[PDB]
Amino acid sequence: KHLFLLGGHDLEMQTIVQILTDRNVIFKDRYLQWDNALLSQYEEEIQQYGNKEPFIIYGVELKEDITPPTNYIRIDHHYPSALEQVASILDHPLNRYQTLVAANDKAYIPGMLEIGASHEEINLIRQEDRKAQGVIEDDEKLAQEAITNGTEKIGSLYVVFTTANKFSPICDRLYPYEKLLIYTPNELIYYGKGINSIQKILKRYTPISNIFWGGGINGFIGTVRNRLTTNEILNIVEQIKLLEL
Ligand SMILES: [Mn+2]
């Protein structure tokens, strides 16, 4: 008797829920999100089924903050994706939509281009991932108005002013880009090349406790919402634009 505990919600997890549902496999979805994708949320299930023989508990991208039981199998990324692993466990053959979900999860748009995604499949997967991540229609429409009316190109840098709360509707519509700076009155995020030079600027204005970053070709660096004043953000924006001279 297999039991799945699900973690952070994205297109993959939403595609996993659908496969589990169509294979009649029991799962508990606590509508979790990356900020709280912890094995601790499921202690009630861990204490009912854990170490009991007949049950195998699969954890799907669950952070193991408490000690897992003996009948726990971890499903995460390191190499197959959680969707592929779950699909091998269930011997479910992935359809085209599902192979594109897996590719998008592993490698964003380049991963879909490598499997031969048409332009309208990429848009559809991108749109469906943004919905599954909680982007509301308003941010989509604010991204279109920001791109159309508040986007200003300087050197290789895209600079976008917006009142949106989520920025993926902007990123996905401006891709491919080399440098992208998105700012609101309350936060800014920088995407693309040169994150370390942007790092010097941000530290001149805030502790590193309020800065978040990720490396690589899809690298980014930004400030946590409302941790900088609007005046400080406006000043930081100018200094980033002076890096293009
Ligand atoms: Mn994944």
CA distance 188 to 227: 10
174 Cα: distance to centroid of ligand 1 (angstroms)? 23
Phi and psi torsions of 178, nearest 5°: -95, -40
Resolution (A): 2.4
CA distance 1 to 26: 9
CA distances (Å), 64 to each of 72, 90, 244, in order?
Answer: 11, 23, 44
Contact 198, 208 (CB under 8 A): no
Contact 8, 75 (CB under 8 A): no
Contact 227, 206 (CB under 8 A): yes
Experimental method for this entry? X-ray
14 Cα: distance to centroid of ligand 1 (angstroms)? 11
| Amino acid of residue 204 | R
74 Cα: distance to centroid of ligand 1 (angstroms)? 13
CA distance 221 to 194: 10
**Could you list which residues have their CB under 5 Å from ion ligand 1?**
12, 82, 105
Token code pair at residue 24: 């009649």
225 Cα: distance to centroid of ligand 1 (angstroms)? 26
CA distance 59 to 66: 13
Give the residue carrying structure tokens 């499921």: 42
187 Cα: distance to centroid of ligand 1 (angstroms)? 27
Buried b or exposed e, range 131-147, using 16+ CB within 10 angstroms = ebbebeeebbebbeebb
Sign of the four-CA dihedral 62, 68, 69, 70: positive
202 Cα: distance to centroid of ligand 1 (angstroms)? 30
Contact 221, 213 (CB under 8 A): yes
Contact 61, 13 (CB under 8 A): yes
127 Cα: distance to centroid of ligand 1 (angstroms)? 17
25 Cα: distance to centroid of ligand 1 (angstroms)? 20
